PDB file of all heavy atoms in Angstrom:
ATOM      1  N   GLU A   1       3.494   5.152  10.625  1.00  0.00           N
ATOM      2  CA  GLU A   1       2.249   4.997  10.010  1.00  0.00           C
ATOM      3  C   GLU A   1       2.147   3.830   9.087  1.00  0.00           C
ATOM      4  O   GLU A   1       1.150   3.428   8.976  1.00  0.00           O
ATOM      5  CB  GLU A   1       1.965   6.370   9.086  1.00  0.00           C
ATOM      6  CG  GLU A   1       1.936   7.685   9.842  1.00  0.00           C
ATOM      7  CD  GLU A   1       0.723   7.743  10.705  1.00  0.00           C
ATOM      8  OE1 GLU A   1      -0.287   7.770  10.365  1.00  0.00           O
ATOM      9  OE2 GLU A   1       0.952   7.725  11.928  1.00  0.00           O
ATOM     10  N   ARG A   2       3.175   3.133   8.856  1.00  0.00           N
ATOM     11  CA  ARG A   2       3.009   1.884   8.046  1.00  0.00           C
ATOM     12  C   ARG A   2       2.327   0.853   8.928  1.00  0.00           C
ATOM     13  O   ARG A   2       1.760  -0.087   8.250  1.00  0.00           O
ATOM     14  CB  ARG A   2       4.423   1.390   7.657  1.00  0.00           C
ATOM     15  CG  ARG A   2       4.460   0.307   6.655  1.00  0.00           C
ATOM     16  CD  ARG A   2       5.830  -0.009   6.182  1.00  0.00           C
ATOM     17  NE  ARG A   2       6.560   0.959   5.352  1.00  0.00           N
ATOM     18  CZ  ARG A   2       6.926   0.761   4.184  1.00  0.00           C
ATOM     19  NH1 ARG A   2       6.542  -0.225   3.443  1.00  0.00           N
ATOM     20  NH2 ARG A   2       7.604   1.757   3.600  1.00  0.00           N
ATOM     21  N   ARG A   3       2.393   0.956  10.241  1.00  0.00           N
ATOM     22  CA  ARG A   3       1.680  -0.075  11.026  1.00  0.00           C
ATOM     23  C   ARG A   3       0.126  -0.351  10.726  1.00  0.00           C
ATOM     24  O   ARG A   3      -0.437  -1.341  11.035  1.00  0.00           O
ATOM     25  CB  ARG A   3       1.717   0.241  12.591  1.00  0.00           C
ATOM     26  CG  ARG A   3       1.023   1.458  13.089  1.00  0.00           C
ATOM     27  CD  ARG A   3       1.491   1.979  14.394  1.00  0.00           C
ATOM     28  NE  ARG A   3       0.736   3.030  15.132  1.00  0.00           N
ATOM     29  CZ  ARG A   3       1.000   4.362  15.070  1.00  0.00           C
ATOM     30  NH1 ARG A   3       1.972   4.852  14.359  1.00  0.00           N
ATOM     31  NH2 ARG A   3       0.105   5.204  15.743  1.00  0.00           N
ATOM     32  N   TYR A   4      -0.390   0.789  10.272  1.00  0.00           N
ATOM     33  CA  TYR A   4      -1.763   0.671   9.936  1.00  0.00           C
ATOM     34  C   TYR A   4      -2.086  -0.095   8.585  1.00  0.00           C
ATOM     35  O   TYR A   4      -3.291  -0.413   8.378  1.00  0.00           O
ATOM     36  CB  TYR A   4      -2.426   2.213   9.776  1.00  0.00           C
ATOM     37  CG  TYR A   4      -2.376   2.942  10.924  1.00  0.00           C
ATOM     38  CD1 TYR A   4      -1.427   4.048  11.128  1.00  0.00           C
ATOM     39  CD2 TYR A   4      -3.441   2.886  11.914  1.00  0.00           C
ATOM     40  CE1 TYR A   4      -1.459   4.831  12.276  1.00  0.00           C
ATOM     41  CE2 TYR A   4      -3.298   3.610  13.108  1.00  0.00           C
ATOM     42  CZ  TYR A   4      -2.300   4.532  13.147  1.00  0.00           C
ATOM     43  OH  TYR A   4      -2.494   5.398  14.335  1.00  0.00           O
ATOM     44  N   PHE A   5      -1.067  -0.414   7.864  1.00  0.00           N
ATOM     45  CA  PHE A   5      -1.238  -1.077   6.661  1.00  0.00           C
ATOM     46  C   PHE A   5      -0.386  -2.410   6.656  1.00  0.00           C
ATOM     47  O   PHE A   5       0.784  -2.451   6.343  1.00  0.00           O
ATOM     48  CB  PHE A   5      -0.620  -0.210   5.451  1.00  0.00           C
ATOM     49  CG  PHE A   5      -1.155   1.166   5.396  1.00  0.00           C
ATOM     50  CD1 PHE A   5      -0.724   2.134   6.072  1.00  0.00           C
ATOM     51  CD2 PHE A   5      -2.347   1.320   4.694  1.00  0.00           C
ATOM     52  CE1 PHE A   5      -1.432   3.432   6.030  1.00  0.00           C
ATOM     53  CE2 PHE A   5      -2.909   2.512   4.485  1.00  0.00           C
ATOM     54  CZ  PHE A   5      -2.490   3.683   5.159  1.00  0.00           C
ATOM     55  N   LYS A   6      -1.043  -3.420   7.448  1.00  0.00           N
ATOM     56  CA  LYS A   6      -0.344  -4.539   7.861  1.00  0.00           C
ATOM     57  C   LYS A   6       0.388  -5.314   6.823  1.00  0.00           C
ATOM     58  O   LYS A   6       1.408  -6.055   6.937  1.00  0.00           O
ATOM     59  CB  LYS A   6      -1.252  -5.407   8.738  1.00  0.00           C
ATOM     60  CG  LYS A   6      -2.249  -6.234   7.933  1.00  0.00           C
ATOM     61  CD  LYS A   6      -3.192  -7.027   8.845  1.00  0.00           C
ATOM     62  CE  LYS A   6      -3.882  -8.056   8.062  1.00  0.00           C
ATOM     63  NZ  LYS A   6      -4.867  -8.780   9.008  1.00  0.00           N
ATOM     64  N   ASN A   7      -0.081  -5.327   5.644  1.00  0.00           N
ATOM     65  CA  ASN A   7       0.504  -5.994   4.542  1.00  0.00           C
ATOM     66  C   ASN A   7       1.606  -5.353   3.794  1.00  0.00           C
ATOM     67  O   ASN A   7       2.317  -6.004   2.967  1.00  0.00           O
ATOM     68  CB  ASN A   7      -0.631  -6.400   3.443  1.00  0.00           C
ATOM     69  CG  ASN A   7      -1.564  -7.399   4.083  1.00  0.00           C
ATOM     70  OD1 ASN A   7      -1.119  -8.406   4.698  1.00  0.00           O
ATOM     71  ND2 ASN A   7      -2.858  -6.994   3.883  1.00  0.00           N
ATOM     72  N   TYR A   8       1.892  -4.170   4.201  1.00  0.00           N
ATOM     73  CA  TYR A   8       2.995  -3.373   3.532  1.00  0.00           C
ATOM     74  C   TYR A   8       4.274  -3.409   4.366  1.00  0.00           C
ATOM     75  O   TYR A   8       5.387  -2.812   4.079  1.00  0.00           O
ATOM     76  CB  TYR A   8       2.591  -1.912   3.305  1.00  0.00           C
ATOM     77  CG  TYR A   8       1.375  -1.710   2.365  1.00  0.00           C
ATOM     78  CD1 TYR A   8       0.759  -0.500   2.377  1.00  0.00           C
ATOM     79  CD2 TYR A   8       0.994  -2.795   1.623  1.00  0.00           C
ATOM     80  CE1 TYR A   8      -0.231  -0.256   1.618  1.00  0.00           C
ATOM     81  CE2 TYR A   8      -0.129  -2.567   0.742  1.00  0.00           C
ATOM     82  CZ  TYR A   8      -0.919  -1.354   0.876  1.00  0.00           C
ATOM     83  OH  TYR A   8      -1.971  -1.159   0.103  1.00  0.00           O
ATOM     84  N   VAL A   9       4.142  -4.087   5.587  1.00  0.00           N
ATOM     85  CA  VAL A   9       5.240  -4.026   6.532  1.00  0.00           C
ATOM     86  C   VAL A   9       6.311  -4.852   5.946  1.00  0.00           C
ATOM     87  O   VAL A   9       6.092  -5.878   5.473  1.00  0.00           O
ATOM     88  CB  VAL A   9       4.762  -4.511   7.950  1.00  0.00           C
ATOM     89  CG1 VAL A   9       5.965  -4.940   8.862  1.00  0.00           C
ATOM     90  CG2 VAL A   9       3.694  -3.447   8.650  1.00  0.00           C
ATOM     91  N   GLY A  10       7.578  -4.344   6.161  1.00  0.00           N
ATOM     92  CA  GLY A  10       8.706  -5.306   5.568  1.00  0.00           C
ATOM     93  C   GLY A  10       8.911  -5.442   4.081  1.00  0.00           C
ATOM     94  O   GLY A  10       9.636  -6.284   3.466  1.00  0.00           O
ATOM     95  N   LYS A  11       8.194  -4.515   3.371  1.00  0.00           N
ATOM     96  CA  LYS A  11       8.264  -4.749   1.851  1.00  0.00           C
ATOM     97  C   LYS A  11       8.957  -3.476   1.405  1.00  0.00           C
ATOM     98  O   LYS A  11       8.639  -2.342   1.652  1.00  0.00           O
ATOM     99  CB  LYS A  11       6.833  -4.858   1.268  1.00  0.00           C
ATOM    100  CG  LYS A  11       6.310  -5.982   1.855  1.00  0.00           C
ATOM    101  CD  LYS A  11       5.014  -6.483   1.163  1.00  0.00           C
ATOM    102  CE  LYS A  11       4.647  -7.893   1.502  1.00  0.00           C
ATOM    103  NZ  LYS A  11       5.956  -8.738   1.499  1.00  0.00           N
ATOM    104  N   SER A  12       9.876  -3.725   0.419  1.00  0.00           N
ATOM    105  CA  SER A  12      10.466  -2.518  -0.215  1.00  0.00           C
ATOM    106  C   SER A  12       9.472  -1.941  -1.135  1.00  0.00           C
ATOM    107  O   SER A  12       8.327  -2.495  -1.478  1.00  0.00           O
ATOM    108  CB  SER A  12      11.514  -3.103  -1.197  1.00  0.00           C
ATOM    109  OG  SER A  12      11.034  -3.958  -2.264  1.00  0.00           O
ATOM    110  N   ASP A  13       9.793  -0.714  -1.563  1.00  0.00           N
ATOM    111  CA  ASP A  13       8.975  -0.080  -2.671  1.00  0.00           C
ATOM    112  C   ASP A  13       8.588  -0.931  -3.864  1.00  0.00           C
ATOM    113  O   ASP A  13       7.439  -1.013  -4.322  1.00  0.00           O
ATOM    114  CB  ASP A  13       9.515   1.261  -3.068  1.00  0.00           C
ATOM    115  CG  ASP A  13       9.734   2.194  -2.000  1.00  0.00           C
ATOM    116  OD1 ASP A  13       9.264   2.017  -0.782  1.00  0.00           O
ATOM    117  OD2 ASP A  13      10.296   3.169  -2.291  1.00  0.00           O
ATOM    118  N   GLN A  14       9.571  -1.712  -4.603  1.00  0.00           N
ATOM    119  CA  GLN A  14       9.286  -2.510  -5.777  1.00  0.00           C
ATOM    120  C   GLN A  14       8.442  -3.720  -5.375  1.00  0.00           C
ATOM    121  O   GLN A  14       7.528  -4.225  -6.080  1.00  0.00           O
ATOM    122  CB  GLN A  14      10.547  -2.954  -6.411  1.00  0.00           C
ATOM    123  CG  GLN A  14      11.262  -1.845  -7.190  1.00  0.00           C
ATOM    124  CD  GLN A  14      10.401  -0.947  -8.176  1.00  0.00           C
ATOM    125  OE1 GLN A  14      10.693   0.291  -8.116  1.00  0.00           O
ATOM    126  NE2 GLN A  14       9.618  -1.448  -8.972  1.00  0.00           N
ATOM    127  N   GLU A  15       8.644  -4.320  -4.147  1.00  0.00           N
ATOM    128  CA  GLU A  15       7.917  -5.406  -3.669  1.00  0.00           C
ATOM    129  C   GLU A  15       6.423  -4.935  -3.653  1.00  0.00           C
ATOM    130  O   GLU A  15       5.495  -5.518  -4.080  1.00  0.00           O
ATOM    131  CB  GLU A  15       8.311  -6.076  -2.382  1.00  0.00           C
ATOM    132  CG  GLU A  15       9.739  -6.600  -2.469  1.00  0.00           C
ATOM    133  CD  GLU A  15      10.815  -6.495  -1.244  1.00  0.00           C
ATOM    134  OE1 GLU A  15      10.479  -6.396  -0.182  1.00  0.00           O
ATOM    135  OE2 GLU A  15      12.028  -6.539  -1.554  1.00  0.00           O
ATOM    136  N   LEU A  16       6.199  -3.655  -3.040  1.00  0.00           N
ATOM    137  CA  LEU A  16       4.943  -3.066  -2.893  1.00  0.00           C
ATOM    138  C   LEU A  16       4.350  -2.957  -4.239  1.00  0.00           C
ATOM    139  O   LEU A  16       3.026  -3.188  -4.340  1.00  0.00           O
ATOM    140  CB  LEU A  16       4.986  -1.693  -2.195  1.00  0.00           C
ATOM    141  CG  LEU A  16       5.204  -1.791  -0.728  1.00  0.00           C
ATOM    142  CD1 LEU A  16       5.358  -0.531  -0.087  1.00  0.00           C
ATOM    143  CD2 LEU A  16       4.073  -2.706  -0.003  1.00  0.00           C
ATOM    144  N   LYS A  17       5.024  -2.342  -5.246  1.00  0.00           N
ATOM    145  CA  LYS A  17       4.484  -2.222  -6.555  1.00  0.00           C
ATOM    146  C   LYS A  17       4.199  -3.582  -7.293  1.00  0.00           C
ATOM    147  O   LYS A  17       3.426  -3.553  -8.383  1.00  0.00           O
ATOM    148  CB  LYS A  17       5.384  -1.304  -7.346  1.00  0.00           C
ATOM    149  CG  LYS A  17       5.456   0.076  -6.809  1.00  0.00           C
ATOM    150  CD  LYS A  17       6.483   0.891  -7.419  1.00  0.00           C
ATOM    151  CE  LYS A  17       6.392   2.162  -6.631  1.00  0.00           C
ATOM    152  NZ  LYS A  17       7.320   3.414  -7.325  1.00  0.00           N
ATOM    153  N   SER A  18       4.620  -4.763  -6.747  1.00  0.00           N
ATOM    154  CA  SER A  18       4.283  -6.071  -7.330  1.00  0.00           C
ATOM    155  C   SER A  18       3.011  -6.637  -6.721  1.00  0.00           C
ATOM    156  O   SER A  18       2.498  -7.707  -7.074  1.00  0.00           O
ATOM    157  CB  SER A  18       5.496  -7.190  -7.021  1.00  0.00           C
ATOM    158  OG  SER A  18       5.443  -7.574  -5.573  1.00  0.00           O
ATOM    159  N   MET A  19       2.401  -5.897  -5.774  1.00  0.00           N
ATOM    160  CA  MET A  19       1.269  -6.324  -4.929  1.00  0.00           C
ATOM    161  C   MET A  19       0.154  -5.625  -5.528  1.00  0.00           C
ATOM    162  O   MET A  19       0.018  -4.247  -5.414  1.00  0.00           O
ATOM    163  CB  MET A  19       1.378  -6.033  -3.455  1.00  0.00           C
ATOM    164  CG  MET A  19       2.669  -6.847  -3.059  1.00  0.00           C
ATOM    165  SD  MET A  19       3.062  -6.548  -1.363  1.00  0.00           S
ATOM    166  CE  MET A  19       1.700  -5.670  -0.717  1.00  0.00           C
ATOM    167  N   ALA A  20      -0.895  -6.433  -6.091  1.00  0.00           N
ATOM    168  CA  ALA A  20      -2.057  -5.778  -6.648  1.00  0.00           C
ATOM    169  C   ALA A  20      -2.652  -4.779  -5.962  1.00  0.00           C
ATOM    170  O   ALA A  20      -3.105  -3.711  -6.368  1.00  0.00           O
ATOM    171  CB  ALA A  20      -3.088  -6.926  -7.125  1.00  0.00           C
ATOM    172  N   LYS A  21      -2.910  -5.139  -4.481  1.00  0.00           N
ATOM    173  CA  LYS A  21      -3.661  -4.191  -3.652  1.00  0.00           C
ATOM    174  C   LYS A  21      -3.019  -2.953  -3.392  1.00  0.00           C
ATOM    175  O   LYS A  21      -3.715  -1.951  -3.057  1.00  0.00           O
ATOM    176  CB  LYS A  21      -4.012  -5.027  -2.174  1.00  0.00           C
ATOM    177  CG  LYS A  21      -5.428  -5.598  -2.201  1.00  0.00           C
ATOM    178  CD  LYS A  21      -5.760  -6.565  -1.353  1.00  0.00           C
ATOM    179  CE  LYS A  21      -7.015  -7.373  -1.806  1.00  0.00           C
ATOM    180  NZ  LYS A  21      -7.732  -8.185  -0.810  1.00  0.00           N
ATOM    181  N   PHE A  22      -1.581  -2.981  -3.306  1.00  0.00           N
ATOM    182  CA  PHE A  22      -0.978  -1.647  -3.122  1.00  0.00           C
ATOM    183  C   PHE A  22      -1.244  -0.715  -4.166  1.00  0.00           C
ATOM    184  O   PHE A  22      -1.658   0.417  -3.943  1.00  0.00           O
ATOM    185  CB  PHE A  22       0.533  -1.971  -3.080  1.00  0.00           C
ATOM    186  CG  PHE A  22       1.325  -0.539  -2.948  1.00  0.00           C
ATOM    187  CD1 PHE A  22       1.432   0.091  -1.701  1.00  0.00           C
ATOM    188  CD2 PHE A  22       1.895   0.058  -4.000  1.00  0.00           C
ATOM    189  CE1 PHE A  22       2.174   1.263  -1.611  1.00  0.00           C
ATOM    190  CE2 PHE A  22       2.801   1.028  -3.950  1.00  0.00           C
ATOM    191  CZ  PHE A  22       2.769   1.804  -2.746  1.00  0.00           C
ATOM    192  N   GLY A  23      -1.055  -0.974  -5.533  1.00  0.00           N
ATOM    193  CA  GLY A  23      -1.500  -0.006  -6.671  1.00  0.00           C
ATOM    194  C   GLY A  23      -2.892   0.188  -6.621  1.00  0.00           C
ATOM    195  O   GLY A  23      -3.262   1.498  -6.791  1.00  0.00           O
ATOM    196  N   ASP A  24      -3.712  -0.763  -6.426  1.00  0.00           N
ATOM    197  CA  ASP A  24      -5.164  -0.631  -6.552  1.00  0.00           C
ATOM    198  C   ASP A  24      -5.621   0.182  -5.498  1.00  0.00           C
ATOM    199  O   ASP A  24      -6.507   1.181  -5.668  1.00  0.00           O
ATOM    200  CB  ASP A  24      -5.853  -2.042  -6.438  1.00  0.00           C
ATOM    201  CG  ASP A  24      -7.445  -1.917  -6.790  1.00  0.00           C
ATOM    202  OD1 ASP A  24      -7.716  -2.038  -8.153  1.00  0.00           O
ATOM    203  OD2 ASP A  24      -8.135  -1.799  -5.960  1.00  0.00           O
ATOM    204  N   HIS A  25      -5.424  -0.142  -4.221  1.00  0.00           N
ATOM    205  CA  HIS A  25      -5.942   0.642  -2.987  1.00  0.00           C
ATOM    206  C   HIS A  25      -5.257   1.980  -2.904  1.00  0.00           C
ATOM    207  O   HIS A  25      -6.029   2.919  -2.637  1.00  0.00           O
ATOM    208  CB  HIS A  25      -5.784  -0.284  -1.837  1.00  0.00           C
ATOM    209  CG  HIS A  25      -6.594  -1.576  -1.852  1.00  0.00           C
ATOM    210  ND1 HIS A  25      -6.885  -2.338  -0.766  1.00  0.00           N
ATOM    211  CD2 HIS A  25      -7.309  -2.155  -2.872  1.00  0.00           C
ATOM    212  CE1 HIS A  25      -7.677  -3.431  -0.950  1.00  0.00           C
ATOM    213  NE2 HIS A  25      -7.862  -3.370  -2.288  1.00  0.00           N
ATOM    214  N   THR A  26      -3.967   2.239  -3.269  1.00  0.00           N
ATOM    215  CA  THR A  26      -3.439   3.632  -3.265  1.00  0.00           C
ATOM    216  C   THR A  26      -4.049   4.455  -4.409  1.00  0.00           C
ATOM    217  O   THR A  26      -4.371   5.678  -3.985  1.00  0.00           O
ATOM    218  CB  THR A  26      -1.861   3.817  -3.467  1.00  0.00           C
ATOM    219  OG1 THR A  26      -1.479   3.227  -4.743  1.00  0.00           O
ATOM    220  CG2 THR A  26      -1.008   3.455  -2.457  1.00  0.00           C
ATOM    221  N   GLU A  27      -4.232   3.986  -5.507  1.00  0.00           N
ATOM    222  CA  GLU A  27      -4.973   4.733  -6.523  1.00  0.00           C
ATOM    223  C   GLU A  27      -6.384   5.062  -5.970  1.00  0.00           C
ATOM    224  O   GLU A  27      -6.923   6.227  -6.150  1.00  0.00           O
ATOM    225  CB  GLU A  27      -5.009   3.999  -7.875  1.00  0.00           C
ATOM    226  CG  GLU A  27      -6.181   4.713  -8.693  1.00  0.00           C
ATOM    227  CD  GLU A  27      -5.938   4.451 -10.143  1.00  0.00           C
ATOM    228  OE1 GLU A  27      -4.978   3.976 -10.468  1.00  0.00           O
ATOM    229  OE2 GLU A  27      -6.816   4.770 -10.888  1.00  0.00           O
ATOM    230  N   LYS A  28      -7.193   4.158  -5.451  1.00  0.00           N
ATOM    231  CA  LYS A  28      -8.482   4.490  -4.887  1.00  0.00           C
ATOM    232  C   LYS A  28      -8.531   5.576  -3.679  1.00  0.00           C
ATOM    233  O   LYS A  28      -9.420   6.318  -3.788  1.00  0.00           O
ATOM    234  CB  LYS A  28      -9.177   3.194  -4.375  1.00  0.00           C
ATOM    235  CG  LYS A  28      -9.573   2.367  -5.762  1.00  0.00           C
ATOM    236  CD  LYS A  28     -10.171   0.991  -5.528  1.00  0.00           C
ATOM    237  CE  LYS A  28     -10.440   0.246  -7.051  1.00  0.00           C
ATOM    238  NZ  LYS A  28     -10.729  -1.126  -6.704  1.00  0.00           N
ATOM    239  N   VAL A  29      -7.438   5.536  -2.871  1.00  0.00           N
ATOM    240  CA  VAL A  29      -7.323   6.572  -1.967  1.00  0.00           C
ATOM    241  C   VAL A  29      -7.161   7.873  -2.571  1.00  0.00           C
ATOM    242  O   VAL A  29      -7.870   8.906  -2.331  1.00  0.00           O
ATOM    243  CB  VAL A  29      -6.055   6.283  -1.184  1.00  0.00           C
ATOM    244  CG1 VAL A  29      -5.632   7.592  -0.296  1.00  0.00           C
ATOM    245  CG2 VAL A  29      -6.164   5.007  -0.209  1.00  0.00           C
ATOM    246  N   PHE A  30      -6.319   8.064  -3.599  1.00  0.00           N
ATOM    247  CA  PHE A  30      -6.075   9.245  -4.181  1.00  0.00           C
ATOM    248  C   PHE A  30      -7.189   9.616  -5.200  1.00  0.00           C
ATOM    249  O   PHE A  30      -7.439  10.835  -5.335  1.00  0.00           O
ATOM    250  CB  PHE A  30      -4.692   9.321  -4.863  1.00  0.00           C
ATOM    251  CG  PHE A  30      -3.656   9.635  -3.797  1.00  0.00           C
ATOM    252  CD1 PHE A  30      -3.234   8.660  -2.906  1.00  0.00           C
ATOM    253  CD2 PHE A  30      -3.200  11.059  -3.532  1.00  0.00           C
ATOM    254  CE1 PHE A  30      -2.232   8.720  -1.909  1.00  0.00           C
ATOM    255  CE2 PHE A  30      -2.277  11.145  -2.506  1.00  0.00           C
ATOM    256  CZ  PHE A  30      -1.814  10.185  -1.769  1.00  0.00           C
ATOM    257  N   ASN A  31      -7.932   8.764  -5.719  1.00  0.00           N
ATOM    258  CA  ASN A  31      -9.112   9.025  -6.382  1.00  0.00           C
ATOM    259  C   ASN A  31     -10.142   9.660  -5.540  1.00  0.00           C
ATOM    260  O   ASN A  31     -10.730  10.824  -5.922  1.00  0.00           O
ATOM    261  CB  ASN A  31      -9.702   7.935  -7.097  1.00  0.00           C
ATOM    262  CG  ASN A  31     -11.027   8.245  -7.813  1.00  0.00           C
ATOM    263  OD1 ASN A  31     -11.104   8.959  -8.705  1.00  0.00           O
ATOM    264  ND2 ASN A  31     -12.175   7.665  -7.368  1.00  0.00           N
ATOM    265  N   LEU A  32     -10.313   9.184  -4.390  1.00  0.00           N
ATOM    266  CA  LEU A  32     -11.296   9.851  -3.436  1.00  0.00           C
ATOM    267  C   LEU A  32     -10.715  11.210  -2.921  1.00  0.00           C
ATOM    268  O   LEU A  32     -11.470  12.190  -3.038  1.00  0.00           O
ATOM    269  CB  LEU A  32     -11.565   8.924  -2.224  1.00  0.00           C
ATOM    270  CG  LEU A  32     -12.583   9.593  -1.284  1.00  0.00           C
ATOM    271  CD1 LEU A  32     -13.906   9.956  -1.893  1.00  0.00           C
ATOM    272  CD2 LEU A  32     -12.844   8.448  -0.187  1.00  0.00           C
TER     273      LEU A  32
END
């Protein structure tokens, strides 16, 4: 399922957490 999120491919969980869009866009998903 990660293929649908092209910018998260190859990133560890902490690398993800350093990426503004990852926290911002996951919080938006869960807010909706």
Side-chain angles (χ1 to χ4, degrees):
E1 296 292 295
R2 189 178 295 244
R3 77 199 187 256
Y4 293 105
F5 298 94
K6 74 183 193 180
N7 294 314
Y8 301 160
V9 170
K11 303 192 160 317
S12 63
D13 295 1
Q14 288 313 134
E15 294 141 31
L16 288 175
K17 296 172 185 195
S18 76
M19 294 175 16
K21 261 162 199 197
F22 174 81
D24 188 87
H25 295 193
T26 52
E27 164 162 347
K28 291 173 183 170
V29 168
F30 285 75
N31 173 67
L32 184 54

